[PDB]
């Protein structure tokens, strides 16, 4: 039961749920001139999405939702989630984006079309902002979970009784995550004022993350495959697990 966790248990569950850090797939003994940067990043992102499913299923309360609802939330959120992870791992790399341990790019490497130089700079500024806030790992996992639960919660196109229950559940969990962030902050010695202030600062950054995702989606839709499985459909298949591998 997600609504029964204590703050410590919420944090411990998020921390234990973290996905791995993957590597970009390229021949390191090959000229950099030769790689397609978008190809690299597309390959990486696509591998990260499988692990994002496994992560999401471990976010307390997520699998209490309907399959359809779980797909919708991921369909709305996945790009924000890739981005907040990128920005987290880039904190200790001022001026650079740590896409993977073997793929650290500066803004000059974002310029090869099109494109990214816009998104690049925005991602770097957000990384800068987290650096300046001394964002902690325990706060980061709360925020990534909040994105998962929140990004899609006002675009469910139903007001069925089931859909009211789904939303109410999501709002309860999100409330629990707010309580957890506040707890982390009191435990770190912050005054109540600084607690409310820092909570607000962190949530306000999620709106820049939304922006960045929308801008990035604009680029990705402007380059979309034709006779392909819709994302909803890829998401649904990865989420719609059997229990034969128990």
**What are the binding residues for 17beta-estradiol?**
48, 89, 219
CA torsion, points 86, 62, 179, 9, in degrees to nearest 10? -90
Q: Which of 71, 82, 122, 209 binds ligand C3D (CB under 6 A)?
A: 82
Task: Yes or no: say if 181 and 139 are a contact pair by the CB < 8 Å rule.
Answer: yes
The count of residues interacting with its own copies (CB under 8 A) is 37
Q: Per-residue string for binding with its own copies, 200-229, x by CB under 8 A?
A: xx-xxxxxxxxx--xx--x-----------
The listed partner (ligand C3D, its own copies, none) that binds 73, CB under 5 to 8 Å by sort, is none
For ligand C3D, the binding residue among 7, 10, 17, 48 (CB under 6 A) is 48
Residues 6+ apart with CB under 8 A from 90: 96, 97, 98, 123, 124, 127
Could you say whether residue 231 binds ligand C3D (CB under 6 A)? yes
* Phi, psi for residue 22 in degrees, rounded to 5: -95, 165
Could you give the CA distance from residue 140 to residue 84 in angstroms, rounded to a whole number? Answer: 8
Buried b (16+ CB within 10 A) or exposed e, 30-52: eeeeeeebbebbeebbeebbeeb
CB 56 within 8 A of CB 132: no
Residue 119 engages ligand C3D in binding (rule: CB under 6 A): yes
Give the residues lining the site for ligand C3D (CB under 6 A).
Answer: 41-42, 44-46, 48-49, 82-83, 85-86, 99, 116, 119, 216, 219-220, 231
Give the residues lining the site for its own copies (CB under 8 A).
Answer: 121-122, 125-126, 129, 146, 150-151, 154-155, 157, 171, 174-175, 178-179, 182, 192-193, 195-197, 199-201, 203-211, 214-215, 218
């Amino acid at each position: 039961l997600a609504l029964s966790l204590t703050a410590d248990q919420m944090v411990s569950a998020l921390l234990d749920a973290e996905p791995p850090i993957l590597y970009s797939e390229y021949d390191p003994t090959r000229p950099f001139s030769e790689a397609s940067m978008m190809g690299l990043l597309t390959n990486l992102a696509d591998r990260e999405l499988v692990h994002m499913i496994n992560w999401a299923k471990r976010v307390p309360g997520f699998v209490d939702l309907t399959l359809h609802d779980q797909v919708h939330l991921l369909e709305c959120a996945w790009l924000e989630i890739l981005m907040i992870g990128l920005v987290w791992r880039s904190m200790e790399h001022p001026g650079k984006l740590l896409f993977a341990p073997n793929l650290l790019l500066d803004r000059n490497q974002g310029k090869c079309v099109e494109g990214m130089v816009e998104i690049f700079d925005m991602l770097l500024a957000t990384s800068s902002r987290f650096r300046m806030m001394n964002l902690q790992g325990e706060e980061f996992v709360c925020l990534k979970s909040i994105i998962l639960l929140n990004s899609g919660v006002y675009t469910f196109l139903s007001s069925t009784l089931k859909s009211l229950e789904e939303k109410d559940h999501i709002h309860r969990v999100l409330d629990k995550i707010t309580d957890t962030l506040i707890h982390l902050m009191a435990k770190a010695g912050l005054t109540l004022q600084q607690q409310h202030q820092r909570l607000a600062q962190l949530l306000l950054i999620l709106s820049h993350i939304r922006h960045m995702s929308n801008k990035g989606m604009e680029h990705l839709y402007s380059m979309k495959c034709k006779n392909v499985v819709p994302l909803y459909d890829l998401l649904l298949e990865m989420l719609d697990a059997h229990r034969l591998h128990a």
